């Protein structure tokens, strides 16, 4: 219909929503028609929960009335809270992330993890001897681990002046946070001050709260995150460039398809092997199924997308769409991001909802709770019970749409410097040269309220013609790959200048850096050239957009970026545009202070404009053409 | 007025009523008239801002629409997610309090911190040797600090099973919140991992969330408050009997009138001991005041009272009362209840607002920042800057309204076993006897929505004439103050039992235990009778109320004591009634999990009936009359 042709630019898209339209399934578009309109006050931020002296909200009425909380709280500290609640919320989820993933590789360094190995060992005594860890090149390996499991969890202690990977970035980068009072010195720590400033009566200056906002976000960015980020290569391997497909069509009608969903792939990587045992593989066999079939969601496909190559089915609001094709016999979700209409669309098949971490809890779920000691055990029974729901799937309403896009995945900053030679010297001579213009990495969601993909793709296509070189990752990764953007055919589409560059390489224009976490490798490559150039990332023709956000994360992200000295744009505004001093602050005001800003452009070729003007003068303070 | 009359029960501040509303100053009751009535889906927690795929309303709507979010998420999730961060933002307030006291104690032992000493060494060793300290009963006192302190940090860290005060509670108790996975790990970590959970797509079932709620509560009342309550004992001196006096009667017309406010004692002490400096008196005497007066607001001034015996001059709804006065030369103020209003109302006089802390800034306010190693440089500047301004007090507008009311204090758990001969096998007599038939802990703030102390006083008579001993804390202490019940004599308003215990002792009928995180000081006791009986805690008669609490930190408490076998009472309810199974949960669900449950119950007389029945069925399960 009209309508459902509105809600996606994809085939596959279109013809689940057909399908769910007929079969009477409900999705995330249909809810968020029913929410709209919104409420005007948590639309614009001005309204407050944080203590019962309220419920307040912030009016601009005749009589004067409501202009103040019960506390006195005006609109700008009500916003700015608000906002500050908001990014740690983003912030808390990489924290998790990345605490789990010190959890494991402590569990492997003790030999209590079966199944699990260090598989990047070169990689584990670079990172350790980066962070500190004595003769990290030559002690053994689980020693050389448990030294860097201490410094890691240190980093989530409350003892640090500086997070361990700050050291990363530029000395005036580090001078500048010193400075502002920014300075991340404990992935929870910052989170926790947070929620104690926006408590009634305590910070009470708007100003002072998006100052904190910035140090709890960079606490994720150089910390959670990029933790998460450097654990999992060094527990699942370094990602190298590698092929795959994406999109609903790589689900198969004659193999148990089990889709595993959400962010942490300690879990999916068991997953992953479990199915390869002989005796799963029988069990599959006796079932009539050809094979046992895993494919990615979100970004824990993200994951096994850059290190396995495993196939993308889709992304964020492709989640619901892919158990209405009828052949999802098992969804293995951990946390994050995991819509709870799943289970009951689960429930109109034969589709398992199978939940695996203490965290992620869903209501009506199969819970088999997965943990680094007996997930080789929990990992084998779930793929069991994807089995078992294959045997009672319903062929008659199976429908697979679409044949899978081809597309390049594994590029990560290791990946990146060897197709270099090895050193990033071939990358800095071609942007002085001008062939590559700059960089952005597109990154975020997708957002009912924005036609799926129309505007990752439209940006992407947009920045790669004008010699500008896309790093996607996230849900954009999908969007990206289904556009036919992620091969190096694809450089077709870009400028003369990025065009001969990525034929020389054998690289596409648009490079996939991995998931959400690994927006810390943004932060890596941006802070590696900002220190070979001797100057501030806030000189570096760099962009970092997210043109269909709807998560914290996103929001957690964006703000780290514009921290870092990175001008971020977002397709749709934060709920603050009832205070026109954070607004201001969001959007001018932190150019001022730490060289970068948001910018909110529902258009994406508005948008490209902005990220390109940015870009150019940066650009200018080189001396670049 | 009548309407001035409704707002309190106490003449001075009847008294700043009528004087404000003749010089045209807006209160709290003020604006809590223009913010009612309250936004119907915020007072029932049924609205969600956590992601702009957002803002989400759940409503019962003939039509069947907005039953979930547009991620999917029902009532039961929204409300129990808001009310996770609702506890969570509780938490992290007295998280950040004792961190604060941790790095004083550190900066101390490192010998950084002009004016700051271990003044109870005693209590030091007691401590460290019970937390395992190597020979703290023989090392050097600023040693045992520094092992003491690392014992701390570590509870702040993310690699325990427990934290470190845990040990206290019975056995029982440990055993039963490690079935429920309640136990306590990590006083920022249950922080941010609520912020995780409560996140789109991670944790989205109720139970759950509730039984994190429980814990992240849990690591505050066994965390960061009683690290709080002990570290600050062990800086300043543990509390013992004393006398004082009571409400804005405690300002002088002619003296240097200084207010702290806030929390935390590390400042509010500091800025006592520069009041007593002989040249900073000579200062206050040249500019014509008889001496400097410190009066304390809230718990800061809680804190002051346990130790110094300062009086208190108010309570929550008694701040913005104090500047009206006209004789509040200066405010003091660290973090937490502190309404920006107070800025407001200091500028239509010659008050000087200051604040100390990074963490609580005010827009307006002159800020002085105290750290450990300057605090005794810092808050001699601050009360310059009182002696100044009182030089500016205008005479005509001062009107101090009361005469104090003498009570006494310092009842820490260190006085009360004292005062039993070393042992507490003369209250455990007593018990037994049914001279005491229990005890009641009465905690919490004022809330607008109350005529201010009217449910404080009235639960707490009614509950010493059934011959239940009342344990004050927080700004109930303001409230049982006034009322004449802090005092030896007014054992002659309590049953028979009560006051013959209570002459035999000569200690009031109700004791006042200290400050919001010296709540610590309740579960203490009740751990140490609970295991010196060999019961539950959740097997003595004890009970908590809260009749007229308002802020996050009062439900963090509240669903502490819960979680921890002491029934709680609630004057008014969180903003969870939108969902009836949360409700559920929160009122009956629990006393099946952790041996106690909310109660919400606007009537203070029915209040005391629901908190004796509770005492009355546990002295029959330990067979007592
Ligand atoms: S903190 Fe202030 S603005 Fe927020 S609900 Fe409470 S009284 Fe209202
Ligand atoms: S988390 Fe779910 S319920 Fe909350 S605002 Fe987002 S879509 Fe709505
Ligand atoms: S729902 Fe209460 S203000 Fe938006």
Chains 1, 2 share one sequence.
Request: net charge neutral.
């Amino acid at each position: 219909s009209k309508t459902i042709r509105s809600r996606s630019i994809w085939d596959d898209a279109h013809a689940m929503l057909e399908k769910a339209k007929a079969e009477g399934i409900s999705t995330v578009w249909d809810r968020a028609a029913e929410q709209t309109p919104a409420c005007k006050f948590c639309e614009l931020g001005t309204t407050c929960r944080n203590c019962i002296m309220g419920p307040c909200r912030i009016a601009n009425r005749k009589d004067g009335k409501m202009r103040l909380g019960v506390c006195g709280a005006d609109a700008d500290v009500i916003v700015a809270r608000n906002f500050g609640r908001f990014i740690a919320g983003g912030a808390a989820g990489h924290s998790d992330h990345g605490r789990d993933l010190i959890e494991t590789l402590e569990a492997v360094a003790e030999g209590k993890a079966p199944g699990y190995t260090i598989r990047d060992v070169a990689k584990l005594r670079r990172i350790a001897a980066e962070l500190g860890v004595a003769d990290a090149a030559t002690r053994p390996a689980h020693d050389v681990a448990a030294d860097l499991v201490t410094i890691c969890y240190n980093d989530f202690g409350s003892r640090r002046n500086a997070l361990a990977f700050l050291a990363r970035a530029p000395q005036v980068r580090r001078d500048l946070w010193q400075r502002l009072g920014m300075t991340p010195r404990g992935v929870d720590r910052e989170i926790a001050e947070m929620m104690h400033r926006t408590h009634m009566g305590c910070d009470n200056d708007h100003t002072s709260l998006l100052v904190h906002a910035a140090r709890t976000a960079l606490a994720d960015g150089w910390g959670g995150s990029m933790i998460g980020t450097e654990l999992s290569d060094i527990l699942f391997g370094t990602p190298r460039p590698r092929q795959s497909t994406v999109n609903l069509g790589v689900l198969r009608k004659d193999a148990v398809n089990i889709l595993v969903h959400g962010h942490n792939p300690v879990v999916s990587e068991m997953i992953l092997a479990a199915t390869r045992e002989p005796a799963v593989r029988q069990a599959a066999q006796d079932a009539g199924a050809a094979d046992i079939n895993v494919a990615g969601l979100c970004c824990t496909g993200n994951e096994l997308l850059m290190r396995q190559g495993i196939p993308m089915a889709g992304n964020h609001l492709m989640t619901e769409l892919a158990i209405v094709t009828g052949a999802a016999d098992a969804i293995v979700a951990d946390y994050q991001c995991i819509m709870p209409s799943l289970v009951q669309i689960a429930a109109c098949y034969h589709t398992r909802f199978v939940t695996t971490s203490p965290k992620g809890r869903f209501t009506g779920a199969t819970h088999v709770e997965v943990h680094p000691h007996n997930a080789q055990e929990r990992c084998r029974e779930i793929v069991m019970l994807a089995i078992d729901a294959y045997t009672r799937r319903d062929p008659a309403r199976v429908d697979i749409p679409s044949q899978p896009v081809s597309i390049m995945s594994g590029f990560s900053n290791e990946a990146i410097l060897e197709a270099l030679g090895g050193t990033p010297k071939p990358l800095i001579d071609a942007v002085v040269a001008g062939q590559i213009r700059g960089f952005v990495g597109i990154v975020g969601c997708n957002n009912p309220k924005i036609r799926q993909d129309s505007a990752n793709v439209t940006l992407t296509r947009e920045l790669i013609r004008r010699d500008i070189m896309v790093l996607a990752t996230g849900c954009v990764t999908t969007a990206a790959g289904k556009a036919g953007l992620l091969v190096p055919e694809a450089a077709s589409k870009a400028g003369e200048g990025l065009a001969a560059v990525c034929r020389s390489l054998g690289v596409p224009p648009v490079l996939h850096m991995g998931s959400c976490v690994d927006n810390s490798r943004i932060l890596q490559l941006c802070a590696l050239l900002a220190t070979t150039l001797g100057v501030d990332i806030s000189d570096l023709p760099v962009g970092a957009s997210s043109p269909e956000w709807y998560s914290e994360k996103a929001a957690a992200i964006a703000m780290y970026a514009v921290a870092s000295g990175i001008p971020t744009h977002l397709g749709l505004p934060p709920n603050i545009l009832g205070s026109e001093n954070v607004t201001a602050m969001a959007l001018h005001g932190l150019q001022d202070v730490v060289g970068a800003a948001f910018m909110v452009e529902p258009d994406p070729v508005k948008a490209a404009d902005m990220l390109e003007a940015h870009i150019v003068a940066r650009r200018a303070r080189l001396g670049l053409t």
